[PDB]
Amino acid sequence: EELLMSLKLKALYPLTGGYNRHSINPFYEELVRPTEIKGLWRWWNRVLFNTLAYSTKGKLYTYESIDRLFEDVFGSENKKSAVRLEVITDEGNDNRFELSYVELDKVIDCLRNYKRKVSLDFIDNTLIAEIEGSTKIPISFKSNLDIDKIIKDLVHNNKLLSFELLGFKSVEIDATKISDKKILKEILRDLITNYLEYFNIKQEVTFTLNIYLDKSREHKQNFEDKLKFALYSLLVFILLGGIGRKTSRGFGSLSIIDVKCYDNSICKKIEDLAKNFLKISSGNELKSKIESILDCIKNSCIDTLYIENNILSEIDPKKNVVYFINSDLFEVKRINDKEKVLANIYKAVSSEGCCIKSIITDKYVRKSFLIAFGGYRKVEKDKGLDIGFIKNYLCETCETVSSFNIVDFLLSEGSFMSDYILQYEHRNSLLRFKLISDNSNNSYLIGYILHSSYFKKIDIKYVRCILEKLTYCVI
Amino acid sequence: STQREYVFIPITNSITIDVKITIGGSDHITNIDERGIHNVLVITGYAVDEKNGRLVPTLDPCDYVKGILVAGTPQQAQSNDFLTLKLPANKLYLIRKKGNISDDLKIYIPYSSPDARNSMKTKPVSISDDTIVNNIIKEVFDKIYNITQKEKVKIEKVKEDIKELFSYYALEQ
Amino acid sequence: STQREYVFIPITNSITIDVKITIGGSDHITNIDERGIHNVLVITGYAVDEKNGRLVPTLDPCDYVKGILVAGTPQQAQSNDFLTLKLPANKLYLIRKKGNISDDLKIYIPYSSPDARNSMKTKPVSISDDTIVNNIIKEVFDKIYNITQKEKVKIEKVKEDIKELFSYYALEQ
Amino acid sequence: STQREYVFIPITNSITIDVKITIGGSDHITNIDERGIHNVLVITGYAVDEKNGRLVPTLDPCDYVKGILVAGTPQQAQSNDFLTLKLPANKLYLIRKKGNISDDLKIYIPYSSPDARNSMKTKPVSISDDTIVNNIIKEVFDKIYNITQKEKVKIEKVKEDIKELFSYYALEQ
Amino acid sequence: STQREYVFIPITNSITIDVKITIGGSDHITNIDERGIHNVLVITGYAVDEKNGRLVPTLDPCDYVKGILVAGTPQQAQSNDFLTLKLPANKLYLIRKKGNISDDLKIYIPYSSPDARNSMKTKPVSISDDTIVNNIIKEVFDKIYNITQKEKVKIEKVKEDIKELFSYYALEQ
């Protein structure tokens, strides 16, 4: 075993989770989970691979076979991983979340013989137990983690973050039946912890990502070639994706501070292509680099492209979904207020925000666009024609003014994609954002659209200059 | 805006109408056309006193007083039973938010002083014996808001909400 | 049912003791036993006026004033701005509560009527200015108690105990 | 059909008036329906030159300028400082669109050319420094709608609206 | 970084420090910031000789000499008793690792010469008798790191791990 390479990266406002869905907990703190890197690296490998397969073969391959193809690198049920990650985040402390005291016993007395719901809000460095039965009583707590002011701003001013607080902030309390205080004092006490821990957010989380090789994986078929392709999918993971939660909206965006390597025979082009991001100096100059890195994985420097192997499996378009990189939908602007655009992206992904109420100026072409691009949207098909008039935009074949047709989305009935694109509460967003920079103080927002397989076909330039105006008013 | 009155609504027949000329304009707070009583300002730290409701300023945060808001008279141009306090229209703890508010309001409330030699002993009592409903909705809603809630029939939404609108605690002395 | 007064602890220099002399009795709810200040009152919807330290009320349950509450009489000079309450010892809000006090008190509160000259843009501030923390320590703790700065060297912890709890709101006007 | 002319918002000293006849009627390319302006226009690939405040074409898609299009001609004496396009506005990047513009638009944009003796690297800087915000509300905005600070409730918040909306690139040379 | 130097922890302090100035910059490797002693180098196959001890080399992998590594110049350019080694920081064995370390390090560890006519026969020696640990504390910890250690609790903590976190083998001849 020996160290393959080292990637000193940084993350921008990462929302890394844990057992409690927060980056800190009563026991430890991890702002970077080496399990999420390995999990996302594999996700950005099954995407890049199907990109290399939808540019040289016109074929798409299922996930359970791409990793079966790469299991000699990332490992599987039949083989240990050949690469092993090791994240060494800086400041290397213990830094658990400790709640020293929380003086709350009036709100306890405000909660006898009643079924209310407590709700926490952080108003001017002080939190309030908003009993929806009209009692905004304050609380005098004292804890760690020093919420400065900025996160309190950043959370309240970002409509996405504030929307996900709706879980971690409130809970009903039935007390008409037998009640207590030793029990209520412990219900409310953790409700504080699960709330303040949501505010352990930090910009500029600097960590290293050491990647080791074992030197015991004999070159089965393309080991030396499968591996150096995985490094490519790791760079595009760094350059297009982030770690943590809501990375499809800019959070946890990754950068590159300095890349070393220790085996020139493999990492040669990878470190070089990675070296080209330490000194980015112009918006459309990076738009060239984003394409420079991508094409060197395509027809230029074709990394052994051994698709002619009996491991893969073509997908079924009417029952499978696959995400791959459309090399054309890419936009690199420039920004100087990360927090502003981080809160602006809500203007571009919400069905009422002041960026797509301008670009796609209607109800249906607006919503139906998000339904097919903005991940999964809560669309309640209990009202009138606004389930079909958005269907009329997303049919497989019907009267279309805009090209948002889905591979088997039929009207008057529901196929597999008909329910999937409509009722499946876990669907990633094809429209993504990422803020990237280092050593230049020149932050560049990046916008792109992952190409899916359920799309019948998409008018490239139309939905591009939709995305174009998008990335413009997001600043 | 300008002068406005916080009409707290218990079950009692004490100060039901109690209110002379309004602004004349319709810059009201609680209009209940068809979608339930909305923007129902209710305040904390007072008690209905169970009789001759003066809203004794209590110091229990658990304690509170509910009611409605409307730009009526200051008790036929009176001030000795008020607060004359000004609002920024964001430090008002409103219920069932409906967006639009003004910048400043001169909210006026029936006031009082602490009755000496008497522990307040605020006691929670909700709205019951609903014969008060047609007593108030005809008086404080059909004489204060008789443009909606009369040309409509969706007042069963209001009917069920009357008891489900104002709870209150009381000194009960 | 003895008398009490709310001698709040602001960051303002307008504190002589602001009401009147020490108890004359022997009971003190705001003790110093465990490690510092205890049994503070954090009544809501007020401010210190930054001068002439009464409390201006507000209809916002998010405006807070803290500070020690001690016994005594209301200055025998101004009985037109003080409440003269009577609390049943159950319906008041405390912090760092200690051995229960289950007997009523007639507490006194410095309260200047709202007097809506301006609009109250109350703003928060916690106790700071290490120069001024010893200021209100000397004029109050050395005076009303004579327990600090001379016989309890643990003040170097009780100094920060002041910085921990006491955080009031003011109008900055 | 219609005539319009460009007025962006820099912090410079070249926005004095320098404009001929007003709308002719009263309809601009923008409106005011929320607390802030709408229908701001964007040209990509132009900077402000920070002196002699016309917009010189660049060929970088990362180049920002935005404002509101005032109706009318530029005195027909500077018949070369402006573009005078004619489009149905469907080829017009407009933000906060509140109206359907099916007719055609004569839009006159302060134009220039590099005549480059040297290089030209534009610099991104937005508006801040409140002394500037209420400075541009008086020489740019009391003239567009003839509605400001007479019956408004919005202008003081439009200052916040102008801050976060209008962002311009600048040569700074 | 640039030139560093490791130094062992011998109970015999004939070479207690005998090393010259700090970085010239501001980067150390070991430190006692809040919790405990951080990065500590362990090299293998080197006995001290504890008599002008400068890490006599041997081939036994049983031997080791723990000890801090500070970025000091090699004893005012002492050209006799160092190894002047540069390494990519991956070839360094750090007990109690803390944080990432630099790209390459030019360390000058005390290197004596492997002597002839004398079989090594090294015997291990550990730390005990805490008057031996304080004879090391101020010399190599509260001198190189002589900014803190008079501010926090980390005094006995440093004499906790010195007893065991630094063991070694000795030639004992």
Degrees to nearest 5, angle at CA A336 with A331 and A337: 105
Q: How far is CA B116 from the centre of its chain?
A: 26
Q: Say yes or no for a CB contact (<8 Å) between B85 and C122.
A: no
H or E, element range at A346 = helix A346-349
CA-nearest of C113, C116, C87 to C102 is C87
Listed residue (A129, A109, A131) closest to A121, CA to CA: A129
CB C93 within 8 A of CB C155: no
C85 touches chain B (CB under 8 A): yes
Cα B152 to chain centroid distance, Å, stands at 23
Q: Rg for chain B (alpha carbons), in Å?
A: 16
Nearest CA in chain A to E38: A92
Amino acid at D158: V
Residues in chain D, overall count: 173
Distance (Å, whole) CA B118 – CA B124 = 18
Interchain proximity C64–A105, CB inside 8 Å: no
Q: Are A449 and A467 in contact (CB under 8 A)?
A: yes
Closest alpha carbon within chain A to B123? A110
CA gap A250, A243 in Å, rounded: 10
DSSP-derived letter for residue E140 is I
- Between C61, C96, C124, which is nearest A103 by CB? C96
Give the CA distances from residue E80 to residues A294, E56, E109, in Å, rounded to whole numbers and listed in that order: 54, 14, 11
CB E104 within 8 A of CB E87: yes
Q: How far is A106 from chain C (nearest CA, A)?
A: 7
Question: How many Å apart are CA B153 and CA B130, to the nearest integer?
Answer: 19
Contact A247, A253 (CB under 8 A): yes
Give me the residue from A282, A336, A358 closest to D97, CB to CB. Answer: A358
Residues B1-38 as b/e (b if ≥16 CB within 10 A, e otherwise) read beebbbbbbbbbeebbebbeebeeeeebbbbbbeeebe
The structure tokens listed for E27 are: 């980067």
Tell which residue, D44, D32, D41, D46, has the closest CA to residue D141: D32
| SS3 track for chain C | CCEEEEEECCCCCCCCCCCCCCCCCCCCCCCCCCCCCCCEECCECCCCCCCCCCCCCCCCCCCECCEEEECCCCCCCCCCCECCCCECCCCCCEECCCCCCCCCEEEECECCCCCCCCCCCCEEEECCCHHHHHHHHHHHHHHHHCCCCCCCCCHHHHHHHHHHHCEEEECCC
Q: Which residues in D have their CB inside 8 Å of a CB on A?
A: 42, 44, 60-62, 64, 93-97, 124, 126, 164, 167
Structure tokens at E100: 């990432």
A137 touches chain B (CB under 8 A): yes
Write b or e for each residue in E51-71: b if 16 or more Cβ atoms lie within 10 A of its Cβ, otherwise e. eebbbbebeeeebbbbbbbbb
D99 neighbors D32 (Cβ within 8 angstroms)? no
Give partners of D (≥3 CB pairs < 8 A). Answer: A
Structural domain boundaries in chain B: 1-173
At residue D92, what is the residue type?
L
Question: Contacts of residue C81 in chain B, CB cutoff 8 Å?
Answer: none
Burial of E156 from C-beta contacts in 10 A (0-12 / 13-18 / 19+): exposed
Q: What is the spatial distance between Cα A208 and Cα E99, in angstroms, rounded to a whole number?
A: 10
CA–CA distance, E171 with E47 (Å, rounded to integer): 6
| Distance, CA of A207 to CA of A200 (rounded, Å) | 17
Contact A230, A70 (CB under 8 A): yes
Q: What is the DSSP string of A162-194?
A: HHHHHHHSEEEE--SSS--STTHHHHHHHHHHH
B108 burial type by CB count under 10 A (0-12 exposed, 13-18 middle, 19+ buried): buried
Which of B121, B15, A189, D141 lies closest to C91, judged by CA?
B121
Q: How far apart are CA D89 and CA D86, in angstroms?
A: 9
Q: Are strands A2-12 and D36-37 parallel, antiparallel or unpaired?
A: unpaired
Unique residue bearing structure tokens 């009417």 = A318
Q: Are C171 and C125 in contact (CB under 8 A)?
A: no
Residue A4, helix vs strand vs coil: strand
| Residue that the structure tokens 């290490």 belong to | C130
Determine which of C91, C105, C117 to mutate to test the interface with B (most B C-beta atoms within 10 Å). Answer: C91
Rounded-to-integer distance, Cα E56 and Cα E54, Å: 6
Beta carbons of D61 and A284 less than 8 Å apart: yes
Amino acid at C119: S
**Are C124 and A126 a contacting pair at CB < 8 A?**
yes
Q: Which helix (H) or strand (E) holds A338?
A: helix A338-344
Resolution value, angstrom units: 2.8
Distance from C-alpha of B21 to C-alpha of B2, rounded to nearest angstrom: 14
Contacts of C31 (CB under 8 A, 6+ apart): C38, C39, C98
Instruction: Give the total residue count for chain E.
Output: 173
D165 in Cβ contact with D40 (< 8 Å)? yes
User: A–D: how many Cβ contacts below 8 A?
Assistant: 30
In whole angstroms, what is the distance from residue C172 CA to residue C124 CA? 9
Distance CA D110, CA B72 (A): 55
For residue A114, give the chain B residue with the closest CA.
B124
**Sign of the torsion formed by the C-alpha atoms of A114, A119, A123 and A127:** positive
Give the C-alpha separation, D156 to B68, whole Å. 30
Instruction: Name, in order, each residue with C-beta under 8 angstroms of C130's C-beta and a sequence gap of 6 or more.
Output: none
Is the Cβ–Cβ distance between D35 and D152 less than 8 Å? no
Q: Is the Cβ pair B44, A134 closer than 8 Å? A: yes
Contact D62 A333 (CB under 8 A): yes
Cβ of A472 within 8 Å of Cβ of D44? The answer is: yes
Helix axis angle for A159-168 and A150-157, nearest 10°, is 100
Write out D93-123 in H/E/C secondary structure: CEECCCCCCCCCEEEECCECCCCCCCCCCCE
What are C101's two structure tokens?
A: 């006090």
CB contact under 8 A, A354 and D95: yes
Give dist(CA D113, CA A89) in Å, integer: 51
Residue C77 near residue C39, CB atoms below 8 Å: no
Short-list A334, A422, A327, A346, CA closest to A377:
A422
| Candidate from A106, A109, A135 with C-beta closest to B64 | A135
Q: A119 phi and psi, to 5 degrees?
A: -145, 135
| Collapsed DSSP state (helix, strand, coil) of residue E160 | helix
Phi and psi at A464, nearest 5°, equal -75, -50
How big is chain D by its Cα radius of gyration, in Å? 16
Contact A416, A457 (CB under 8 A): no
Look at residue E67 and give its three-state secondary structure: strand
What is the distance between the alpha carbons of residues A267 and A274, in angstroms, rounded to a whole number?
A: 10
**What 8-state DSSP symbol labels residue A377?**
-
Q: Is the separation of the CB atoms in A83 and A73 below 8 Å?
A: yes
Is residue B78 within 8 A of residue B18, CB to CB? The reply is no
User: Which residues of chain A lie closer than 8 angstroms to E99, CB-CB?
Assistant: 88, 90-92
Residues in chain C: 173
Helix (H, G, I), strand (E, B) or coil at D148: coil
Copy the structure tokens of residue E55: 């890490």
- Round to the nearest angstrom and report the end-to-end CA distance of chain B: 37
Give E148's strand partners.
Answer: none
Using alpha carbons, list the distances in angstroms from residue A239 to A5, A37, A277, A278, A377.
17, 13, 9, 12, 27
Query: What are the start-end ranges of the H helices in A350-459?
Result: 356-359, 364-373, 391-394, 416-420
Residue E135: helix, strand or coil by DSSP? helix
Tell me how far the alpha carbon of residue C172 is from its chain's centroid.
19
Q: Cβ–Cβ of A3/E90 closer than 8 Å?
A: yes
Long-range contacts (CB closer than 8 Å, 24 or more residues apart) made by A306-309: A306/A221, A306/A222, A306/A225, A307/A53, A307/A56, A307/A57, A307/A59, A309/A69, A309/A221
Q: Are strands A135-143 and A126-131 parallel, antiparallel or unpaired?
A: antiparallel
Residue D90 makes CB contacts below 8 A (sequence gap 6+) with none
A475–D167 C-beta distance less than 8 A: yes
Of residues C91, C86, C92, C82, the one with CA closest to residue C105:
C86
Torsion sign (Cα): B83, B89, B90, B96: positive
Half-sphere exposure of A450 (CA within 13 A, CB side): 29
- Dist CA B18 CA B38 (whole Å): 22
Chain C residues with CB inside 8 Å of B122's CB?
91
DSSP string for residues in chain B: --EEEEEE--SSSSSSS------SS---S---SSS-S-S---EESEE--SSS---EE---SS-EE-EEEE---STTT--TT-------SSSS--SS--S---S--EEE-------TT-----EEE---STHHHHHHIIIIITTTSTTSSSS-STTHHHHHHHHTT--EEE---
Helix A63-74 with A34-53: angle, nearest 10 deg: 120
Which method, experimentally, gave rise to this model?
A: cryo-EM
Touching status, chains C and A (3+ beta-carbon pairs under 8 Å) = yes
- Residues facing residue D34 across a β-bridge: D36
